[PDB]
Nucleic acid binder design. Structure first.
Ligand SMILES: Nc1nc2c(ncn2[C@@H]2O[C@H](COP(=O)(O)O[C@@H]3[C@H](O)[C@@H](COP(=O)(O)OP(=O)(O)OP(=O)(O)O)O[C@H]3n3cnc4c(=O)[nH]c(N)nc43)[C@@H](O)[C@H]2O)c(=O)[nH]1
Ligand SMILES: Nc1nc2c(ncn2[C@@H]2O[C@H](COP(=O)(O)O[C@@H]3[C@H](O)[C@@H](COP(=O)(O)OP(=O)(O)OP(=O)(O)O)O[C@H]3n3cnc4c(=O)[nH]c(N)nc43)[C@@H](O)[C@H]2O)c(=O)[nH]1
Ligand SMILES: [Mn+2]
Ligand SMILES: [Mn+2]
Ligand SMILES: [Mn+2]
Ligand SMILES: [Mn+2]
Ligand SMILES: [Zn+2]
Ligand SMILES: [Zn+2]
Lengths: 352, 341
DNA sequence: ATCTGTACATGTACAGAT
DNA sequence: ATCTGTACATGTACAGAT
DNA sequence: ATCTGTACATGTACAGAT
DNA sequence: ATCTGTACATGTACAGAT
C-alpha cells in the first residue's frame, strides 16, 4: 500500500541522467563565469544541497538546489531583534555592497542575479531562462525545458569558518542519536548565511541575512542511523527516508490542490522528522516492516506541532517556524483537518 | 573480581600528568631539531600512537609511542618476497632504493646529539635493537619511562594491494568508515626483515578504531552506553605482560598479538550488546578462547594484511605457542592466580 | 626552467535496473 | 541476487603563467 | 610556515544517591 | 556494591593571527 506509493514516487535512472546532464552543464558554466574578469564572486565554490542530493526527491528529478558559497573572513554578526536566525553582517572585492561597514544582502544578491542573467543569455543549446524574482527568496531560479520542466535554485551564501552563533548552542540535539563526536565535528564545519530578501517594509530589510545548515542536513540525511551500518550493504535497511518521502508527498499533493496551504513547505516536514528521529533514535524504531506505524507517528507528531502552534527550527531552538507571526492559526487548523481526513480514510490523495 | 584487577591496572591522574609533562618537553625539543636545524627530516610531523593515546595503557604511564612522519613524493613499492607487509621503496638523496638502515641511522644520530644537550631531565638513548624501527629514550623522574620515536614515511596514494581484503570492518564500523579510513595516507617504518626493507604501519588507523569502536555511534560517549571492549583488551594485555615477566619462553610474544586478536573478535562480535559491562567475564573468556584457537592452529592474520600470519612457524616456534597455550589454559581454569601477583 | 589553478584519474556508496 | 549511472572525495598531470 | 586559543572528547577522583 | 554528577587533567582538530 504505502510500498506501492513509494514505487510511484521513485525516480527513474533515465530521467535522472537526462535531468542531471543538462543541470550540470548550466551550473558548471555559471560557476566558471563567477571566477572571471575581476568579478566580486571570484573564489565562490559549489555545494549541492536539498532533496535530490539527499536522495529524498520524489516523483520526478525536476527541482535542484545548489549553493554558491563564498568565504568571507573577519566578519562580525549582530542578531536581528533576538529572532535567532536573522543577522546583520559587518566588516576588498565586496566593497561595492557595503554601507557604513554593513554588508547589504539585496545589493549583493542583485549583482549576483545580474551576472547569472547575463550568462544565461549566452546559452543557445539549451532552453533555459531566469524566473522572475520572488520576494523573500534567497535564490536565483532557473527554468529549463528538455524532456520536462526543471527548476534550479542557485543560492548565494556567505561562508564563515568561525564557531556557530550562540543561538545554535542548544540546537542540533543529536547526542543520543548520532552522538557527541558527530555533533562536535559537524559544529567544526563552517556555517552559511543566505540573503533574507523580503519587502516587508521593516528596518534593515535589505541588509538582513538568514542562517543555512543545508550542508549539515545533507550529512544527516546520508548518515542517519544510530548504527554506522544503517542502510549500508552489510547493514540493515531502515524506513527513515521512506517516511520523509511519504510526508513530503502528502504535503505536495495537498499544496497543489489547496492554496490555503501556501505558507507551508517541505522544510516544515523535514524539521518535524528531524525531531522525530531525535525522539526515536534506535534504528529498530524505524524497521521497514513498521512503515505504517512510523509514518503514522510522524503524522501524529506533525499534528501536535500544528495544534500547539510550535515547530522549533532543529538548529535554532528559539525560532518557531509555526509562530502566529509566520503562519495564521486558520492555515494550521485547515492543514490539521486535511491531514486528519487523509489519515482516517486510507489516504485517498495518494491515488491522484 | 576482574573489576578489582582493572582498578589496579587503572592509571592515576597524578602519574599521568607528571609523565606526560616530561615526555612532551623531550618530544617537543626533538621535533623542533628535525626542522628548525637544516636536516633531511625538515617537514616531519608528530603523530602520537599506541596504548597511552588509545587509552588502553595499563599499570603505569611508563611507555609512550610517537611517530615522526615524513611526507614523500610518488614513491613506488616492490613487495619483498610476497610477505605482504615488507617492501623496498623508490633532500633524501644521501640515503640511496631508499635504505631504511641509512635513513634510520641519521635520524638516530640526530636524536642522540640532541639528547646530549638536555640538562634538566635525566634521559638517555637505549642501545639499538636490530629489527626495531624505533629510537627508544629512557627517562627517569624517580620513575622509568620509555619513549619510542618511530620514523615513518607517509605516502598519500592508494594502500598497497596486499591490504585490499584487509580491515574487514564492513559489518561492524561499516563501508563508509572503511572507505574513509582507506583515503587516509599509509605509513612505512624501517623495521628491517634486509637493511633496505620497510614495514607497513597502520597505527593511525588502529588509533581511530580504538576511539571509534562501536557499531552504535554513541558507544562509550556521555549520552551512550559504556561497553567493555577496552577493558577486555586491558585484561588480555595484563595476562600476557604478567606471563612474559615470569617466563622467558614467551619472549617472541607481544601486546600487538593481543591487539590483533581482539580486532578480529570485535569484527566477529560486532554488536555493542555483545560487549555489555555486565558480561565482562564471558567477554574476557571468549577472547581467551579465541586466542587459544589462534595458537592451536598457528594462525593469527594481521588485521590489515590478511596473508601475513603473525603466528607462522617462521616467526614463532610451535613450542613457544604450545607453552603459552598451557599457561593460558592453567590461569583460565584456576581463577587467574597470576592477577594477584 | 619552475610553478599552478584547472581538469581529469581513481575509487566507492547509494539506489535504481535487471 | 547482480549490475550500472550519478555523486562526491582525494590524488595527480599539465598547458599556460611566472 | 609556525604558534596560540578555543572547544570538546576521553580519562580519573571522589561524594552523595540509589 | 553500583551509579550519577562534578571537578580536574590530558589530548587533539582547526581557525585566525603573526
Ligand atoms: N521546492 C520547493 N519549493 C517550495 C516548497 N514550498 C514552497 N516552495 C517555493 O518556495 C518559494 C517561496 O519560499 P519559501 O520560504 O516558502 O520556500 C522555502 C523553500 O523553497 C522550501 C523548500 O525548498 P527546497 O529547499 O528545494 O527543499 P528540499 O530540497 O529540502 O525539498 P524539495 O525541493 O523536494 O521540496 O521551504 C521553504 N523554506 C523555509 N525555510 C527554509 C529553510 O530554512 N531552508 C529551506 N531549504 N527551505 C526553507 C516559492 O517559489 C514557493 O513556490 C516546497 O515544498 N518545495
Ligand atoms: N611496549 C612494549 N614493548 C614490547 C612488548 N613486547 C616486546 N616489547 C619490546 O619491543 C622490542 C621489539 O620487539 P617486537 O618487535 O616483538 O615488539 C613490537 C612492539 O614493541 C610491541 C608492541 O609495543 P607498542 O607498539 O608500544 O604497543 P602498544 O602501545 O599498542 O601497547 P603497550 O605498549 O601498552 O604494550 O609489539 C611488537 N610488534 C610486532 N609487530 C608490531 C606492529 O606491527 N606494531 C607494533 N606497534 N608493535 C608490533 C622487544 O625487544 C621488547 O623490548 C610489548 O608488549 N609492549
Ligand atoms: Mn529542492
Ligand atoms: Mn529549492
Ligand atoms: Mn606502547
Ligand atoms: Mn613502544
Ligand atoms: Zn537507514
Ligand atoms: Zn564502547
Amino acid at each position: 500500500k504505502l510500498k506501492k506509493v513509494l514505487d510511484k514516487l521513485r525516480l527513474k535512472r533515465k530521467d535522472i541522467s537526462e535531468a542531471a546532464e543538462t543541470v550540470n552543464k548550466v551550473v558548471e558554466r555559471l560557476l566558471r563565469r563567477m571566477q572571471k574578469r575581476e568579478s566580486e564572486f571570484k573564489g565562490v565554490e559549489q555545494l549541492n544541497t536539498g532533496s535530490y542530493y539527499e536522495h529524498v526527491k520524489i516523483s520526478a528529478p525536476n527541482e535542484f538546489d545548489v549553493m554558491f558559497k563564498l568565504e568571507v573572513p573577519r566578519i562580525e554578526l549582530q542578531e536581528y531583534y533576538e529572532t535567532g536566525a536573522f543577522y546583520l553582517v559587518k566588516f576588498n572585492p565586496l566593497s561595492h555592497f557595503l554601507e557604513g561597514e554593513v554588508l547589504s544582502a539585496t545589493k549583493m544578491l542583485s549583482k549576483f542575479r545580474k551576472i547569472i542573467k547575463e550568462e544565461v543569455k549566452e546559452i543557445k543549446d539549451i532552453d533555459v531562462s531566469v524566473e522572475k524574482e520572488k520576494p523573500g527568496s534567497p535564490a536565483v531560479t532557473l527554468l529549463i525545458r528538455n524532456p520536462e520542466e526543471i527548476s534550479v535554485d542557485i543560492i548565494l551564501a556567505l561562508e564563515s569558518k568561525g564557531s556557530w552563533p550562540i543561538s545554535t548552542k542548544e540546537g542540533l540535539p543529536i547526542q543520543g542519536w548520532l552522538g557527541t563526536k558527530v555533533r562536535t565535528n559537524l559544529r567544526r564545519e563552517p556555517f552559511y548565511l543566505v540573503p533574507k530578501n523580503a519587502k516587508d517594509g521593516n528596518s534593515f530589510q535589505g541588509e538582513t541575512w538568514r542562517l543555512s545548515f543545508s550542508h549539515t542536513e545533507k550529512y544527516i540525511l546520508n548518515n542517519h542511523g544510530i548504527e554506522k551500518t544503517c542502510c549500508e550493504s552489510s547493514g540493515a535497511k531502515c524506513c527513515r527516508k521512506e517516511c520523509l518521502k511519504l510526508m513530503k508527498y502528502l504535503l505536495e499533493q495537498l499544496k497543489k490542490e489547496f492554496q490555503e496551504l501556501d505558507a507551508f513547505c517541505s522544510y516544515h516536514v523535514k524539521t518535524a522528522i528531524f525531531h522525530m528521529w531525535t525522539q526515536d533514535p534506535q534504528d529498530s524504531q524505524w524497521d521497514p516492516r513498521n512503515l505504517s506505524s512510523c509514518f503514522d507517528k510522524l503524522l501524529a507528531f506533525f499534528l501536535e506541532c500544528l495544534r500547539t502552534e510550535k515547530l522549533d527550527h532543529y538548529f535554532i531552538p528559539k525560532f518557531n517556524l509555526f509562530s502566529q507571526e509566520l503562519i495564521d492559526r486558520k492555515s494550521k487548523e485547515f492543514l490539521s483537518k486535511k491531514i486528519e481526513y487523509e489519515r482516517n480514510n486510507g489516504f485517498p490523495i495518494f491515488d491522484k
